[PDB]
Ligand binder design. Structure first.
Ligand SMILES: Cc1cc2nc3c(=O)[nH]c(=O)nc-3n(C[C@H](O)[C@H](O)[C@H](O)COP(=O)(O)OP(=O)(O)OC[C@H]3O[C@@H](n4cnc5c(N)ncnc54)[C@H](O)[C@@H]3O)c2cc1C
Ligand SMILES: Cc1cc2nc3c(=O)[nH]c(=O)nc-3n(C[C@H](O)[C@H](O)[C@H](O)COP(=O)(O)OP(=O)(O)OC[C@H]3O[C@@H](n4cnc5c(N)ncnc54)[C@H](O)[C@@H]3O)c2cc1C
Ligand SMILES: CCOC(=O)c1ccccc1S(=O)(=O)NC(=O)Nc1nc(Cl)cc(OC)n1
Ligand SMILES: CCOC(=O)c1ccccc1S(=O)(=O)NC(=O)Nc1nc(Cl)cc(OC)n1
Ligand SMILES: C/C(NCc1cnc(C)nc1N)=C(/S)CCOP(=O)([O-])OP(=O)([O-])O
Ligand SMILES: C/C(NCc1cnc(C)nc1N)=C(/S)CCOP(=O)([O-])OP(=O)([O-])O
Ligand SMILES: [Mg+2]
Ligand SMILES: [Mg+2]
Ligand SMILES: [Mg+2]
Ligand SMILES: [Mg+2]
Ligand SMILES: [Mg+2]
Lengths: 582, 582
């Protein structure tokens, strides 16, 4: 039973209705940056005792923080911005949350209704702008629609395939007094009828049937399984099928397990891509068959019966035509198949040890390899040390680039929602604010931002947010003085011709630039730089043991390449297993 | 006669056609940030000897730099970004350039044509997103359309009412070889027929007629006069009409002149708003009648014959219905009226000294006033010192907030395109990157960023750009530890209830946070902080005399308010002339 701060017959500002609507949704944390068109909302936020605001230094940092809050908890992330430039600064985050299916609710202020369309001060048609990069958006035209729209927004952002929902609120609606009707019925008749049903036993038994008939089965696990950790693990015990995970599904099945094929795809392991290439049954659970994973669609699992389970009917058969499909919650589908596999255990006699050995041979012959050059710190080894000293229990957020892939390869995530990384959009500057949101969602957790010197500096202003909010955010900065991922493609396909990929100072060419330690110093964050590989273990240990925020500038040779690499649009026979920029 | 780097019969990559298309447009500087979908363009940029790339650290910094390049030169600014997150990071700049009518050409990379619509890697419908916040945009579907689209883009961005034009280029189009046809005809038949004609002598003589019949004429000069500096000055000699300028038109008529009413509007001087309130002839040249200037439209120039000259027919009569209108270039309209006023000089006998004295009385009774508290540095006085030591010849870019208004009030700009500030959108984080673009456009000029501690930190990452590019950018940081403009509205209309407007550290409440000097130190920029008013003159002099970049942290008491202030939607009789937050 909810307790309001106002009488049931007492009129209150629309902004106070908006905030209370968040309270009834269980919202404890918001990332709001104030502005002229949203001052009423910020005033109403101070009157709330249950909602905490984490003030960022940039609205892109605010929405990225809401993402980290969401990806690392399963809750929806809530960011609030003002009209005009405040709203447009959320755009990268909205498109990011859409492509990665992150539950997110963005509230933007707006000019008064009579000023809309008149090119008013700090006015942009944010609804018209964001319609193609959100799951849905609203323009509140009456104060009485606030309780219904906010309920629909949270329902749409979290149910089905999650995504971002933007709610544009004009200033006059925030000031207008009203008595909210919390018993309103949502106007989502078509969307709720389109919601998938629990999976039938008919479809589930045909899948278990195909599992017994198969001799080379591979699990293709993606971001749709982040809530099916236990159900997937139980499913693997009953089948023994190896698990190949995507960049988004990392942690769903423990990466340190003997049945784990780790990540597959363009920068996936050689054995994971081998398993899918030579499989006869591909169990695609919670994936969307991205070109980063498949490459050439005709050659991806070219001799496999493809079972695809997805809660979005639009994804089933979009890129890869499956044999058997199940449109519904993969969590329920695993529960139904676990009871079938458990009762009919002795009837099926499932044993794929021959197929597993065929893959375990590939593990030994083509594992994840990195080269150590003298005393220079290899970034892969730096991440592996972070895995050890944290026991694989840390929440890892990353930027985008070489360091993002190495954080995916050389860290063994044991649970889902430990791995926070922009996959679909691939937005740099994501790691640091996402670490902020993850730490507020998980205060007693180890949050480490494995960032790159290009990505880190983009939203470096959020270091101020980390200190002011006193968040124990660790920044493992893998500094290579380059836009490494773009530099790697320059070495491979453009004869190492540098096209504006060096981030340092050409005058002082051998000096590390900028001095990221002084960025942390400016915001009162203790920092340190480690260059020699011997000091690396003690440096990372100091970062973890030192309470509060900490930045560790880990210098790395820039000639490193992410391996292995399947070129874009290529097949498994085009995999690059060796080579760098030397 | 243009000289190509390729034979007229030699095939070349579409990216090389794109870059050469820029060369034929006279483009010398671009602000490009590389990414996977635009690597071909960046490779083609290195082959160009005439086009320089200024690599920012954030694409929002890139587009804002293109704005400063444009507003401070009259040329179009050119920014280039990759697909997905690179493109979405341009959004705030595009909407900014649209509302302020800044000539700007944005080029975004895109996934290959066959991948569009498939939710591909780093794909966003940037054309669908930006259609409502650009003058026009394109999606290049064939390599042969590049020479025509780039020509149309620059023509649309610069002709008529300027604005931003985005050109989305897929990756396969950049790689495809072709022989460009530079003699292509632009497909803009309706837009060119809609282009305004030179003004008729019929309309111009009726204006001069109304000038002689008027006894209280006021000039309402805005951003449309930035290229009519001489024509407007000559027009004032022949009429003697006082000049009230907008936030965008600052510098069109010298602010230090005896006929200058300085800025009018919400935060405009008392005498400028008085002149418009009690005028009988309002010569609105190059304005759009913003609510920041008019407030309540019915009371704005309620007893004045309104002559409106604008190159956009959509603006004539949108908010304020005029008596006489001229749809065309105000530069030509002034030339035509100057010949009429010069020949018929003795016939007209123009003398408004009675009206000028009525205003000069208001200048003495209600001037721009600031209060000095002990030794605390008043920001107004700090800007006035910058005016002295630079002789009013510096290029000033600002953020958005209290410091933006004080930079508009207490600096006497002598020429147009010295004042670079986000007016319509009002985007924070604009000053520092715009200063970058202005310095590259005007290397031998004094470029000073009068930024606020909130705005400055948003795009603080561009300090690295300033050092790497060795730009003599001065940063006059007016640090008040608050979001001052939002704080001012809290004091006036919300009983000084702080709603997330303090930017410092609440733990160390009296410590200046963050330490902006260390931000400059991180990027190898010499910096200094001045707190006592006595040291202010020497500190600013050191900033100017020290070659290269320099950051000056000017600490100011946060209780200052921007005065005078006409509340939003109010009239002249509601002007607030005194008060602060103490
Ligand atoms: C530089 C870079 C390199 C990359 N290279 C790789 C790579 O090598 N390998 C790789 O895997 N990724 C890579 N990516 C990321 C890639 O772009 C995609 O993010 C990823 O390939 C696709 O993730 P996904 O298949 O799990 O689908 P997601 O984006 O995670 O979407 C989840 C899917 O499952 C469905 N779903 C969601 N919830 C449920 C539910 N409860 N029940 C049932 N279904 C549900 C959804 O409808 C959706 O289709 C890279 C990214 C970057 C930036
Ligand atoms: C915090 C804040 C406070 C502000 N308060 C004020 C204030 O007090 N006073 C103020 O003035 N502004 C203020 N503004 C800015 C305000 O929002 C607008 O930018 C400004 O009021 C309008 O500028 P403008 O009238 O010159 O039109 P512009 O935006 O500069 O547009 C130029 C107009 O002239 C036309 N035009 C362009 N070129 C030509 C040409 N060659 N020939 C003929 N016509 C042409 C265009 O069609 C257009 O209509 C403030 C901004 C902020 C961020
Ligand atoms: C930025 C807010 O925009 C608006 O809401 C707005 C826009 C156009 C006309 C009237 C209003 S209003 O009268 O409904 N409200 C304001 O104008 N608020 C406002 N807040 C701040 Cl902090 C500053 C400002 O102008 C400088 N104006
Ligand atoms: C980010 C570029 O996006 C694309 O162009 C793209 C998208 C989807 C499918 C194929 C391509 S592609 O084969 O036409 N080109 C690439 O995929 N380029 C690319 N560049 C970098 Cl530097 C990295 C990368 O994947 C990590 N991919
Ligand atoms: C520029 C770019 N990609 C294009 C790009 C541009 N801008 C954004 C916001 N996102 C992306 N993905 C990359 S992956 C460079 C990464 O550089 P980094 O942050 O220092 O990481 P690393 O050097 O390990 O590759
Ligand atoms: C938050 C805000 N306005 C809302 C806002 C939010 N975000 C952006 C990008 N732009 C704007 N205009 C202002 S004007 C605060 C200005 O703070 P400042 O940069 O330190 O300048 P000052 O303190 O002098 O007002
Ligand atoms: Mg289908
Ligand atoms: Mg790097
Ligand atoms: Mg009209
Ligand atoms: Mg930034
Ligand atoms: Mg400030």
């Amino acid at each position: 039973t909810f307790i309001s701060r106002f009488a049931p017959d007492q009129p209150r500002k629309g902004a106070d209705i908006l905030v209370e609507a968040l309270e009834r949704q269980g919202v404890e944390t918001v990332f709001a940056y104030p502005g002229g068109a949203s001052m009423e909302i910020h005033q109403a936020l101070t009157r709330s005792s249950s909602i905490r605001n984490v003030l960022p230094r940039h609205e892109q940092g605010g929405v990225f923080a809401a993402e980290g809050y969401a990806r690392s908890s399963g809750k929806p992330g809530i960011c609030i911005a003002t009209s005009g430039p405040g709203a447009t600064n959320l755009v990268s985050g909205l498109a990011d949350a859409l492509l990665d299916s992150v539950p997110l609710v963005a509230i933007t202020g707006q000019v008064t209704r009579r000023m809309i369309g008149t090119d008013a001060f700090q006015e942009t048609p944010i609804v018209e702008v964001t319609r193609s990069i959100t799951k849905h958006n609203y323009l509140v035209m009456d104060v009485e629609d606030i309780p219904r729209i906010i309920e629909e927004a949270f329902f749409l952002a979290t149910s089905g395939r999650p995504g971002p929902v933007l709610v544009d609120v004009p200033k006059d609606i925030q000031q207008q007094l009203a008595i909210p009707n919390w018993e309103q019925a949502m106007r989502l008749p078509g969307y709720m009828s389109r919601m998938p049903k629990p999976p039938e036993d008919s479809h589930l038994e045909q899948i278990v049937r195909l599992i017994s008939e198969s001799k080379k089965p591979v699990l293709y696990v993606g971001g749709g399984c982040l809530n099916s950790s236990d159900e997937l693990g139980r499913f693997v015990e009953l089948t023994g099928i190896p698990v190949a995970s995507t960049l988004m599904g990392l942690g769903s099945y423990p990466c340190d397990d003997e049945l784990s094929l780790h990540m597959l795809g363009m920068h996936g392991t050689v054995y994971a891509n081998y398993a899918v290439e030579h499989s006869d049954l591909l169990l695609a659970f919670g994936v969307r068959f991205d070109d980063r994973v498949t490459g050439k669609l005709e050659a991806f699992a070219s001799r496999a019966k493809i079972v695809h389970i997805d809660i979005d009917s639009a994804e089933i058969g979009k890129n890869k035509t499956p044999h058997v499909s199940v449109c519904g919650d993969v969590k329920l589908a695993l529960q139904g198949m676990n009871k079938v596999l458990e009762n009919r255990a002795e009837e099926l006699k499932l044993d794929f040890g021959v197929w597993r050995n065929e893959l375990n041979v590939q593990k030994q012959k083509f594992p994840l390899s990195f080269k150590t050059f003298g005393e220079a710190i290899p970034p892969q080894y730096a991440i592996k040390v972070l895995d050890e000293l944290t026991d694989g229990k840390a929440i890892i957020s990353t930027g985008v680039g070489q360091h993002q892939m190495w954080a995916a390869q050389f860290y063994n995530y044991k649970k889902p929602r430990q791995w926070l990384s922009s996959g679909g959009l691939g937005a740099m500057g994501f790691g640091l604010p996402a670490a902020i949101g993850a730490s507020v969602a998980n205060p007693d957790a180890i949050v480490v931002d494995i960032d790159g010197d290009g990505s880190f500096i983009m939203n470096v202003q959020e270091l101020a947010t980390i200190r002011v909010e006193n968040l124990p955010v660790k920044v493992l900065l893998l500094n290579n003085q380059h836009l490494g991922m773009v530099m790697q493609w320059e070495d491979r396909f453009y004869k190492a011709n540098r096209a504006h990929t060096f981030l340092g100072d050409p005058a002082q060419e051998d000096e590390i630039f900028p001095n990221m330690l002084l960025f942390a110093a400016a915001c009162g964050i203790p920092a340190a730089r480690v260059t020699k590989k011997a000091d690396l273990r003690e440096a990372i240990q100091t970062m973890l043991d030192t309470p509060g925020p900490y930045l560790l500038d880990v210098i790395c040779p820039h000639q490193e390449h992410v391996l292995p690499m399947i070129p874009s649009g290529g097949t498994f026979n085009d995999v690059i297993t060796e080579g760098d920029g030397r």
